[model samples]
Target: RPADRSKTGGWASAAMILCIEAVERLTTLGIGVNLVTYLTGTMHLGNATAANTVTNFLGTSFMLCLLGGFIADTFLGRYLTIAIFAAIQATGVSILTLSTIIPSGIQLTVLYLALYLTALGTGGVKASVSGFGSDQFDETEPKERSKMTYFFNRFFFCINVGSLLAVTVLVYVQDDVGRKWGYGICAFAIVLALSVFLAGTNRYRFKKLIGSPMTQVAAVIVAAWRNRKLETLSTLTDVEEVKQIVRMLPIWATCILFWTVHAQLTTLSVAQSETLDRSIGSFEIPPASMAVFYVGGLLLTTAVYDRVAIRLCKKLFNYPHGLRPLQRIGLGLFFGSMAMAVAALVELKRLRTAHAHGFYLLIPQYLIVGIGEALIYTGQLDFFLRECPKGMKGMSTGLLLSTLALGFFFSSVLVTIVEKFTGKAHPWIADDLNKGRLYNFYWLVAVLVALNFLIFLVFSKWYVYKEKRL
Candidate 1:
């Protein structure tokens, strides 16, 4: 049967699928935001162990997006990938809640297993959900393709709102209540989300596997190489398209440092808040819940960036609707260095004072970094999607995501080196922040970001756009 059009897809199917990004974030962020505290407080792990644990979990979740996409488009259907992976995500959260009741020996076993399962589940679910939701619009035709961008308006909104809930409500539950109860709610949310998606099964459209986009990329490279001697000018125009992808490597190298710094908000930044004075009117703040400032800053900046900065840019002097993505990316890197500089200053101030400053002083650093995130994330996303040849949008999106994975993973590696070289004799980052020189560590990270910022500008200047590098 040539499928009936009116009865299926469009807004109806989008409604069921879009909410998954929200629900998934609820579980993913819920665990991670507070996981460090649990590891240090309950498990009695050192600061280095707990911090690395958080980063590795985060990096693994991002890394899995590649494999998940490979399995989905190459062989397994996108829908099944979601259901099966989401099922295990739910299962893992359930195990996490159960591990709370069990004894310490086996609890450690279940803990690692539960955490990785969620990581695997998220890799598949997030990689597919948007593509699956967009399927309802049928981009094979022109008119429907026009509606695709609007679909993402809703898609991004769901993910942001889900993150909002995780940072605020979920963190509150975990801190004020119990870890088991919080994780239980996370598991329950996934089950409900899964049920909603399954109910829409009959109405949704299933796009067949087109195979991985990497295969397309590889094919282009192989063709260009094979024809190099036989036809020099014949494939000249073809080689220009290939040049677009090759340009991304240096851009990626410079862009990753931005995310490495961003990882600190969930790790060191949260740990610092635990030590500071967070009291307001006798009700203390939850350390993880302090991310509200970061989220608030990002949302407010993105809203203003879209409404004011973009409109002003167009009216004043014409250039690509607003700033060039490279320009936007450059400013974002600048802001990251500034944020880290502020963070180091605050750490230094804390060390000098009789009592550490209140967590209120940390708000500006969060706000600054969140502002940086709005710029870098959107600019990089646009740069990848826009600059790539038409055939490899998904592959480029994966490339954009890999920076974050690399960033989180790199932070873990950097921590180990500090432990090794800085002389564990009086480690810079101890289980106790006051005893160690955390300020010096933040200064090192700040200098590295500034160096990366300079390198990014050099590359962005040298590169050519889709307009033609040849």
Candidate 2:
């Protein structure tokens, strides 16, 4: 019942948090956009090893999201959890920075440890940041509510802007100044993000902490065991439950395939970009800089797509109704599949030109991939926010993060299988990534995307969306 009536603190908190999120994303993407090349080129690791390591880092980071959600919901409120995790991240970054000056073995070990720590921080921080920002605005007032929505969209837009810069600049740094300085700059940005978050902490509203998932699940199980009444409360009977279970199969299977294709950004795509000719007329682009095109394209698409959707809805639907979140997501998936297909075709070209052409020849593939990302990434956020159950938004967001982590795991497993079968580190591109096995990886992604599209078509019937017409 205590409303922070002035609202100055709330707005300030939201603004600062948005800034923090932008910086944090910039740091994260700056590292990720360059990770594959960094591992193979700078660390001098094998393709399989580097891919596996990156996958592990991604997977662990995702797992931490679940952990973070638990902590935020239960013991530590969102603010405290974010502060604690961010400080820990700062320390991890510092350790990683130190490792750069030390031996390569130490650097590699530290890098792994730093990634784990960073994931822990990210899981905690991400779980709370969005909702916490929203909490500042009271939904009772239509003006305030509309502002909140605008803020959310713009906040995400800023994230892409930051990503664009990070991909362009940090990548340039990595390509020119060396990996140590590049990573060190990211570390510093993270440190600044944490500091900004803390400075604005007191200005926000703090939500009541819900208990951890384990405790809640335990309570549910114990209650069910004790009370027969709980067991009979299901809305679905035998046939319906069975049907629901069957329906889930297609969704789950299809998502895995989609994720596999998506994972190429870190693995196959990175390698592919490295081997291609990046020269455009007279200018050359680093593999990492190619990621900027993706980010930039995403921003452009968000604006153009939203406006087109608004116009289409006005003409076709009789009013300015927005597209359903799932519709948007489906559109994204469709484009994502198209992106892979284009990349696969480009790879075919690269395979032929391998002996004569430079890696820049592959830039077109990445541009197409970027176009796909514009749809897929934005659709993901839209899908999560619209479909997540009330009171469990944080957990749902965590699950989304975990999904990405799982994608990384899937990539690692795929690489391992390919390596084992071919007796080469990355069988798609062979053991020496620089020499160009990226085409094979693109072929693999293309196949997976085709499968995913088929599965999604079949599963479309059971897909439930909660986004309502405004």
Candidate 3:
């Protein structure tokens, strides 16, 4: 009950965390939007190779979020982990910026190493920061909890704030000033952000660290195996039957496919924009600016969708409560599939226009995809938060992030295969830009998305949502 009262420093902590996170998003998204371009254009990698390398970098970064979460919950406190990662990330960016002045061979290796360090640093921050933000709100009182939920949406607003700048300012830096200046800018932002975070350290509420969720999961598996011979042990209540967990594997597998399609926003989508007509009123739209289409659409649709969902729940459910988080997630995924289909269609039109079509052709597709992102990604955050046990919160969040990583991994693998298979085709292998197999790459993604949709429909029925109170 004491926890229900607002702590003297909780709100202050939340505000500082939000500010730090906004800068982190700016740096992350800024680097992300142009990462593939840097690899292919600056580093001179082929489309397939670039996609593979960038996705691998992306995936590794995401996977480390889980590691960070585990460390935060088990050994390191959230603030310490964040601080450590921030320092590491700044170093990586500093090294990355140096690549602009180095020889090509040295630059490539340095940049690659820097990317991995960035991944490690960024992943740690991503895993712990959100949970640390949420910890500011005490869960005991409904009124206080409601306020916390409001803060959560406000948190998203901060992310968008950073995202807008990343798209407009940072992308321009990358495009106009080249990799050196662009990275230098990002590195500076990182330093400023971490400084702000450190300044706020004394005001934050630091939670007690506990054992890792992975260790618990492993313990459960071992106990289940060791007790196989006892009838009474098989009937234990604290543990779920292994069979049910096994069934959930299919759902996880289905999610991986979904993410593969979802992950395109950074890699394939950005790459696809280079072929479109980017000129508009004495201004050439950078490829990263296309993210605006998605972000703007998401902002509008999330507002409308949340309102409608609230109304439907109140009118029909009789409980006058909100829609179950998973329901929103499923609906979001359905929309995401539709957005991908629209993107595929837009690619076809762009291909047909072939050097004649203007950049406007890409806008509709981006808008639709943005809407899908609003629906699905927000839904993902809510769904994972509600479903995971208290001690497992960060790792559960990591699971959702893992979907993006898996998506990137699959995209990488797919691009590699396509490049290898199409290697001998004259146009595909040609040195001239016009003769490349860009169209084929787009078509491949379309087919992959179609398969994702079909698989999701089958597994949609089996997604069991539950809350385990601590």
Instruction: State candidate 2's TM-score.
Output: 0.83
- lDDT score of model 1? 0.81
**Count of backbone collisions within predicted model 2:** 11
Tell me, what's the RMSD of every candidate? 3.2, 4.6, 4.3
TM-score of each: 0.91, 0.83, 0.85
Rank the models by lDDT, top first.
Answer: 1, 3, 2
Task: Report how far residue 371 has shifted in candidate 3, in Å.
Answer: 1.9
Worst 10 residues of 2 by lDDT: 238-247
What count of clashes does model 3 give? 2
Best by lDDT: 1
Which 10-residue span in candidate 1 carries the lowest summed lDDT? 461-470
Model 3 worst lDDT run, 10 consecutive residues: 461-470
User: Candidate 2: where are CA atoms >4 Å away?
Assistant: 1-8, 104-106, 142-154, 211-249, 278-283, 314-327, 356-360, 377-395, 433-438, 462-470
Roughly what TM-score does model 3 have, to 2 decimal places? 0.85
Checking candidate 3 for backbone clashes, the offending pairs are 277-359, 294-370
| lDDT digits (tens) for residues 342-437 of candidate 1 | 989988787778445577878978898899898888788878777776766646777777888999998999898898898676888887778777
Q: Select the stronger candidate by lDDT from 1 and 3.
A: 1
Q: How many residue pairs clash in each candidate?
A: 0, 11, 2
lDDT of 2 by residue, 79-111 (tens): 777778777777776776666677565566677
